[PDB]
């Protein structure tokens, strides 16, 4: 089920397009659905992977789709519900189960035990495959393929984050799943040097509610190429594909 990047990008990047590497934010280009809260349940793997698919649908169909994390939590036997999971395992089960359900059909129930039961899903919403995004292609993947389901090494400093550019510590190891939604640059004046300088960053949609971070999102430093990986973001990096 996993497609190969070099095959997938030749299909979706217009031939010889030049990538604008300074700024591109899916929230200003119709690729991001509202922020969710996983509450008291270790289901980031679902939110990340499912939000990914919400984002592909939005981009490819110019229509708002809200899908059900709880379905994956209840049904994805390759993951551990509220005790963690894996991005690829999440994509595999979306496919082997015959698709996502709408959030309406199958609402979030956090850590309440719930039987897996697809008969409560009327319409089903499929993906065809998913693709791993190489470490040196995140900006290219973002612009042309869409938001990326990614791992991140979170630390207890994330608790305090409520906007700006994060300068807390990182986790020892990758331990949380988020969605990469864009990148930006701010020209910051430097009082010492008396020169303007450029500050690049990646933009990430978290699943801890809109009261965490910047309306739900976190800004992390990177460089012009987008090779710098603050908090080990994207060690696992996947985009779902609708065809």
């Amino acid at each position: 089920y996993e497609a190969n990047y070099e095959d997938v990008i030749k299909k979706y990047k217009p031939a010889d397009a030049k990538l604008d590497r300074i700024a591109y934010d899916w929230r200003l280009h119709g690729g991001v659905t509202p922020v969710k809260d996983q509450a008291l349940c270790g289901s980031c793997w679902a939110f990340s992977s499912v939000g990914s698919v919400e984002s592909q649908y939005a981009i490819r169909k110019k229509a708002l789709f809200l899908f059900s994390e709880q379905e994956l939590v209840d049904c994805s036997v390759k993951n551990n519900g509220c005790y963690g999971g894996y991005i690829t395992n999440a994509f595999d089960d979306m496919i082997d189960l015959g698709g996502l359900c709408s959030q309406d059909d199958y609402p979030y129930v956090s850590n309440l035990p719930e039987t897996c039961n697809l008969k409560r899903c009327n319409e089903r919403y499929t993906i065809k495959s998913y693709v791993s995004i190489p470490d040196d292609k995140f900006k290219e993947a973002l612009r042309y393929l869409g938001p990326i389901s990614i791992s991140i090494a979170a630390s207890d400093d994330f608790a305090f984050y409520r906007g700006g550019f994060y300068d807390g510590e990182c986790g020892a190891a990758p331990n949380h799943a988020v969605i990469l939604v864009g990148y930006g640059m701010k020209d910051i004046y430097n009082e010492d040097t008396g020169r303007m300088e450029k500050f690049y960053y990646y933009i990430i949609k978290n699943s801890w509610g809109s009261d965490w971070g910047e309306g739900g999102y976190i800004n992390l430093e990177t460089d012009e190429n987008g090779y710098k990986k603050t908090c080990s973001i994207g060690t696992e990096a996947y985009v779902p594909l609708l065809e």
Side-chain angles (χ1 to χ4, degrees), residues 18-185:
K18 281 284 185 180
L19 179 57
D20 173 354
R21 256 170 293 242
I22 98 203
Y24 190 85
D25 185 339
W26 278 107
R27 297 170 300 180
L28 298 159
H29 302 284
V32 167
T33 50
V35 161
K36 314 200 182 186
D37 190 2
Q38 68 198 59
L40 201 52
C41 169
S43 49
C44 60
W45 56 274
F47 280 82
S48 175
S49 58
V50 170
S52 246
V53 183
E54 301 187 339
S55 287
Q56 272 304 296
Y57 266 73
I59 297 179
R60 304 307 170 188
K61 302 198 182 306
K62 314 305 191 199
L64 191 86
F65 289 84
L66 306 188
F67 301 137
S68 164
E69 295 81 13
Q70 186 76 44
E71 179 230 352
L72 279 192
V73 168
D74 289 4
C75 300
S76 169
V77 298
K78 294 185 168 60
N79 295 302
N80 294 21
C82 287
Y83 309 112
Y86 297 98
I87 297 151
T88 63
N89 296 9
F91 287 126
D92 292 343
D93 291 348
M94 287 173 206
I95 294 183
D96 283 319
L97 298 163
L100 290 173
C101 304
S102 71
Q103 171 170 278
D104 253 274
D105 281 346
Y106 209 131
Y108 196 56
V109 115
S110 187
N111 57 13
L112 298 195
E114 187 176 68
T115 294
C116 172
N117 188 344
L118 296 168
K119 292 185 177 180
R120 21 196 304 236
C121 304
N122 292 248
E123 215 182 338
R124 305 288 252 90
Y125 301 100
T126 250
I127 70 167
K128 191 60 174 177
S129 79
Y130 57 93
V131 64
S132 178
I133 286 124
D135 283 331
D136 63 347
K137 303 298 189 175
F138 283 9
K139 293 186 160 179
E140 180 191 84
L142 272 150
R143 210 269 165 266
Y144 296 119
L145 302 192
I148 315 179
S149 175
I150 66 180
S151 54
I152 185 178
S155 61
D156 287 338
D157 277 350
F158 280 42
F160 312 135
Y161 178 73
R162 300 288 185 286
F165 305 107
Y166 184 71
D167 67 315
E169 218 155 70
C170 298
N175 57 3
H176 189 64
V178 293
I179 304 175
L180 196 49
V181 296
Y183 47 92
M185 181 228 58

